[PDB]
Amino acid sequence: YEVLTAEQILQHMVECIREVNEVIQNPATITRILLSHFNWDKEKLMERYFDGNLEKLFAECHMPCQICYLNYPNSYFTGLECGHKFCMQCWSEYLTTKIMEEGMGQTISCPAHGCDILVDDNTVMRLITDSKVKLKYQHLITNSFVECNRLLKWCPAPDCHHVVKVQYPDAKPVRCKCGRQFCFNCGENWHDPVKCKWLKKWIKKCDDDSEAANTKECPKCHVTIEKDGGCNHMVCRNQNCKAEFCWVCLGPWEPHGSAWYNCNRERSRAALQRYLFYCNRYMNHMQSLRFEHKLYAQVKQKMEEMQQHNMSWIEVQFLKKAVDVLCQCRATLMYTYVFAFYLKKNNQSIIFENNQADLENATEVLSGYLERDISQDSLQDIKQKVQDKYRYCESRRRVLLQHVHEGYEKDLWE
Ligand SMILES: [Zn+2]
Numbered sequence: 001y002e003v004l005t006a007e008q009i010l011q012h013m014v015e016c017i018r019e020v021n022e023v024i025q026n027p028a029t030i031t032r033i034l035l036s037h038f039n040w041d042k043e044k045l046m047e048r049y050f051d052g053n054l055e056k057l058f059a060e061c062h063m064p065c066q067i068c069y070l071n072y073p074n075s076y077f078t079g080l081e082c083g084h085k086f087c088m089q090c091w092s093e094y095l096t097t098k099i100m101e102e103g104m105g106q107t108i109s110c111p112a113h114g115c116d117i118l119v120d121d122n123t124v125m126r127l128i129t130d131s132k133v134k135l136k137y138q139h140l141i142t143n144s145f146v147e148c149n150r151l152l153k154w155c156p157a158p159d160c161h162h163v164v165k166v167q168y169p170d171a172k173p174v175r176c177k178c179g180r181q182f183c184f185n186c187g188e189n190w191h192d193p194v195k196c197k198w199l200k201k202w203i204k205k206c207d208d209d210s211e212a213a214n215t216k217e218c219p220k221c222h223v224t225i226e227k228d229g230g231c232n233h234m235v236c237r238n239q240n241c242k243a244e245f246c247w248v249c250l251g252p253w254e255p256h257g258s259a260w261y262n263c264n265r266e267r268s269r270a271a272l273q274r275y276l277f278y279c280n281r282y283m284n285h286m287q288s289l290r291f292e293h294k295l296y297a298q299v300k301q302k303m304e305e306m307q308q309h310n311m312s313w314i315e316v317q318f319l320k321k322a323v324d325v326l327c328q329c330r331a332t333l334m335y336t337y338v339f340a341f342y343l344k345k346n347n348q349s350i351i352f353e354n355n356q357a358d359l360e361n362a363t364e365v366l367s368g369y370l371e372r373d374i375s376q377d378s379l380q381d382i383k384q385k386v387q388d389k390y391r392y393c394e395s396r397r398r399v400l401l402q403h404v405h406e407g408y409e410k411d412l413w414e
């Protein structure tokens with residue numbers, strides 16, 4: 001995997017757009033519109049210009065200020081070839097509002113707009129003041145280049161304009177330095193157990209519902225509890241009760257980890273019921289995963305504070321790995337609920353039922369540690385606890401997925 005930025009793509013694109021401008025001689029703005037019409041197959045374009053008329057080929061691809069009326073120094077007016085020149089600010093304003101919304105083409109024509117001769121790319125780049133939107137345009141116009149090209153896929157994050165380039169599209173994990181990780185092929189956050197067809201079945205169904213648990217009330221003292229964290233081992237603070245229960249199911253702790261307790265598991269309405277079950281773990285794990293991403297921030301302080309006193313950088317770096325593994329196992333988990341939802345009751349369903357329930361408690365043992373219980377322990381003691389905790393956490397996942405990878409080898413379920 002190679003990680004590229006947004007500018008690196010636009011710049012790469014410009015070397016591609018420009019080198020093909022012999023003989024086209026049409027400026028970079030035009031060539032890409034052409035290269036989009038012929039869809040970034042190169043030779044397929046050059047041909048269509050030669051053997052027949054270009055006119056048709058184009059047609060397939062088709063003192064004061066004049067906006068805020070005022071007089072400015074000539075330096076403040078930038079013009080187009082059309083012979084209209086307005087404020088640098090009126091431009092940035094006509095630019096930004098036009099690029100944001102609504103969903104537009106790849107063009108941005110003249111501001112007077114009856115003058116429509118499209119503003120060339122670079123001149124749109126210089127002119128947009130806010131850096132956030134400059135990235136949007138960069139993405140906007142570039143979209144065809146990476147869309148029409150295999151091995152180049154956008155980072156599937158709302159704020160990330162980076163793009164991953166691969167040798168071959170094998171559907172494996174990739175890390176964007178985002179630091180988000182995702183399935184290469186379908187472009188969803190890395191789902192190890194599930195299949196893209198099955199995982200995409202949910203995005204339609206999860207979106208199907210028109211109607212995420214922020215607060216809940218204690219089973220023992222009945223007192224209200226807000227969710228902060230993190231692991232689901234819940235100790236409610238009221239002098240009344242020391243419970244000590246589980247968040248997802250409001251039953252106690254620790255029959256969790258015991259074999260006698262499964263935390264894992266007219267006919268028309270019977271379906272929406274078992275969905276509400278299975279989705280609730282998917283949703284609650286995502287929230288419990290979110291508050292773990294905070295730990296990366298605290299872990300930089302935990303290591304910088306620990307290291308100055310006693311040990312060496314190589315020695316402390318296990319403390320990031322704990323969070324890495326924890327954030328790894330937390331992702332692996334909520335996706336096994338895409339897996340478990342569709343696969344039904346078969347003799348292979350109850351075997352993986354155990355690996356998950358073993359992994360579920362694996363996370364809560366680690367996630368509950370790095371949350372609260374960690375800061376009280378001694379430095380010599382903690383390193384051993386963190387180690388043996390995420391050793392099991394990591395082992396479980398490989399043992400969990402050991403099955404799942406051979407379970408799809410010869411069809412066991414659906
Ligand atoms: Zn103006």
Ligand SMILES: [Zn+2]
Pocket residue numbers: 080082083084110111112113115116
């Ligand atoms: Zn004009």
Ligand SMILES: [Zn+2]
Pocket residue numbers: 155156157160161162176177178179180
């Ligand atoms: Zn990213």
Ligand SMILES: [Zn+2]
Pocket residue numbers: 183184185186187188191195196199
């Ligand atoms: Zn996928």
Ligand SMILES: [Zn+2]
Pocket residue numbers: 218219220221222223236237238241242243
């Ligand atoms: Zn209570």
Ligand SMILES: [Zn+2]
Pocket residue numbers: 246247248249250251256263
């Ligand atoms: Zn539970």
